[model samples]
Target chain A: SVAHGLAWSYYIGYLRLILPELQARIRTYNQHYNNLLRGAVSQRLYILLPLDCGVPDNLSMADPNIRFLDKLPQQTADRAGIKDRVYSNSIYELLENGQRAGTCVLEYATPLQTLFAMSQYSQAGFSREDRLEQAKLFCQTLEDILADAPESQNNCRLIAYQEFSLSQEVLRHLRQ
Target chain B: SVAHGLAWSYYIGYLRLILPELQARIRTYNQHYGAVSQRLYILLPLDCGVPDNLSMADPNIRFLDKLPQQTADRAGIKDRVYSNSIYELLENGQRAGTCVLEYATPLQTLFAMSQYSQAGFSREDRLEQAKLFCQTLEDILADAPESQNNCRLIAYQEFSLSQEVLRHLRQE
Candidate 1:
């Protein structure tokens, strides 16, 4: 449920507003508990809200921005799970076991920082310094939020996106 | 003259408004030269002009050999006579190094000086200079034919600049 709620907020790019909205929505659901119709993941205590991106109420496959958050992060969601869109690693290897979940921002920046390094010296049309500053701003802002908690900053991992291998049927349909 | 004017202005980090001043100087130099003086060159003091970073106490202070050598190596500022700095990695801003600049590129000269410019230090502004450097180099390389002579050497430095020096300079 937290996964779903967070995905909604993240999709809309309003990560900071999640708690207030979540609380408001929860209050409404609780007050009208018995009389209203029950949704799949929503009832008196909880409801899954899709992000508002100035469009219809469904996620699109063509969306360019997608993020993958790992568990153990002490960020907005406190952790990652179904509300975060849990994906099965492999259909054949569903033995209900896992290893590492995520790494810290300092670790992630190691590779991404190379882009800045190369650009800083190279005579390319693009400016890597500005991009790196933007990177700094992004990481710093996230670090600054979270009630300025030290543990949260230390444990948090920024979500990133990678290519997900789709099933044959879904892949062909998507390519088509 | 334009090249000299820009290079001098860039060296001091006041490259932005150099065109007007250069024009005025040029007019003065062009007029009545035979009566007062004969000139094939325009000269200014070695330490004259204001630096891009005005907060520093002196404009002529070189991060002395540390900044220039590293910057030249990274920017590929080389010629047949002088080669890239070998001590770049091992020394790494720990020692005062020296590089003699015999010739400078019009665009790269700007960038090398701009590194110490006000824009160079402020992370937000430095990006534009880096981008300008990249774009200018791209164009230069595009036009330059592959060299056929074998008397020269090309050495690529460890691309990352010295963090310690940068952090210290950022204070100024």
Candidate 2:
């Protein structure tokens, strides 16, 4: 009755459109993206010194734009060249004579931002493949920036989403 | 008795000139700076569509400086000039180009304020770290909080604290 009596009952069928493969892929991207946003930029990319960079070193590949980038990317999607790591989303540009970069770290509130933008910007006829291309482009941009990043002796670490209580299962996940 | 005794001791020690570095690091930073004025530079990226060149389609990236801005800029909106982050204390020649955009987003506030906090130690390690800093300063700063007034400890507004705070507390 809850489904049948709903004002927008007809629209509920849209939820049925989410196929398993598509759902899995979306969740994967979301997890990847959230990992990037998980910690403070400084934790992800900062040149801490005295050890030379002054703060807890993330062993980030300190690029010009991002301060500290995790040296080791989790490589969750190695084939896709996707990995879980800390990175700075900077605005860097190659100017006619000088190079310009975003002074602040660039990040997103949610993957939903991209989703919302997708709904808005892409041509009305754009297919799922089109959005896929844009998603790939986003990661590619990051790769280009990270290619020449400053060396980190070791990779910076990510403090996991510590929201959950340290249950036994959580500890098992840690062991892995 | 412990509270009054500690305060009495703190006042005595204050008169005697207590050496810093004896307690929490942030509390130490706080004791030295009551209200620091500062600005934050957040970079935003803009997409410059498909390239005309045949090599490959690469998106363009650009950054602008904003400060004292509403909290949203940290979420990576592409715009020219931004508001500087909050400035309880401004030091060095750290003042660079800053623009205050009228609107704000919590994402911007979280990132910008967190970044600004990094400059100062106000971005406490965790909630406990914050309370600890306040208490530490109470012991050190001449203006030890009176019980009557309660501990006037402050935290960054959640609107401005962002993912950094979320992540910070999550670790706890």
Candidate 3:
């Protein structure tokens, strides 16, 4: 169960430490790009945890908080508005219990989408330099946050988890 | 201008003819791999416009004012396949006039890094690859007219991720 605890703690650290900063950056971006668009803010971090891992007591579905797929409506369960194509496949797995044995997911909104959303309001949209700057900022932010974690070794493992979780089928589909 | 129009048409063909097929395949993938925790779809919509003389509207290009009922019924997510802007060049050289540049998705970044890792591409190897891509783009831009200098040197994500891999490899 040491592995289970390690996985759980890594995700917990992500929620408490990484997600907030990431969300804040996204909010800042949203404001800088599209000041008029209003809502609860589109960026929501979703983690897919193994069934065996005990649920953290602090998480609640009632409020705007870190959403664990297991505690929410099944991915297949219909909801209103746009289905987040970026995360839908990953969500599909947790709800259907499709994660590989001894694995979990750490989900974040794609930075490319932010550019897409930004393009809607500005005639200039983003230049190659602009896109690169945003990409580097995002990549650096993730690295900086992960580097500062108390358990640096576990961060490597967490990254591996995300890398391996990539779906080949989905990749093939996109390449097509 | 003829060459510009051809390139523009090629991308329009990609968006109207190719993008829908790609999106459909991804949707099918979502259903097929319903049990896997993977992020695979990385291609995002891109548009670059040529001059008004060269511009041609694509009839097949579907404007997504709203989601289709059939698509919504099948997948719980909305497909963001629409282009926010048409083929207009930006003033600041962000996008090349009459040239479309694709944005790199997180999945594409991850995938490229994974490939590099698996292939054991050294720091020098990664940097060289990144540089080669940049150089290739420079040559292409150099050959083009000054008006097209703002055109992207290469597909943005490929160039962006190549540099990213170098940084990640350095950290390791």
Candidate closest to the true structure, highest TM-score: 3
- Cα displacement (angstroms), candidate 1, residue B103, comes to 53
Residue-by-residue lDDT tens digits, candidate 1, A78-139: 11100121111100111112421111111121212322332353432325444434344434
Pick the lDDT winner: 3
Q: Given candidate 3, what's the lDDT at residue A45?
A: 35
Model 2 misplaced stretches (Cα beyond 4 Å): A1-42, A45-116, A122-128, A151-176, B1-68, B72-172
Worst 10 residues of 2 chain B by lDDT: B39-48
- The list of candidate 1 runs beyond 4 A from truth reads A1-18, A29-58, A63-140, A147-158, A165-176, B1-172
My TM-score estimates for the predictions, one after another, are: 0.18, 0.20, 0.23
Task: Report the first chain's TM-score for all candidates.
Answer: 0.26, 0.23, 0.32
lDDT of 3 by residue, A36-73 (tens): 63322233333322122222222222112222332112
Q: Model 2 over residues A1-176: C-alpha lDDT tens digits?
A: 11111101111111112111223333443456435644322222211111110111121222222332222221121110011111222221111223322111222222212322323433222244443343333333323323332331112111122122212222232233
lDDT of 2 by residue, B1-172 (tens): 1112222222222212212211232233335542221111121111101121211211111112212211112233222121122211112323222111111111122222224422121334323332332344344434432321221212332222122222322332
Estimate candidate 3's RMSD in Å.
Answer: 20.0
The DockQ of predicted model 1 stands at 0.01
Total clashes, candidate 2? 42
Per-residue lDDT of model 3, residues B30-64, tens digit only? 46431211111112212111111111222221112
What clash count goes with each model?
6, 42, 8
| Cα shift from native, residue B127, model 3 (Å) | 4.4
Best of the two (2, 3) by TM-score: 3
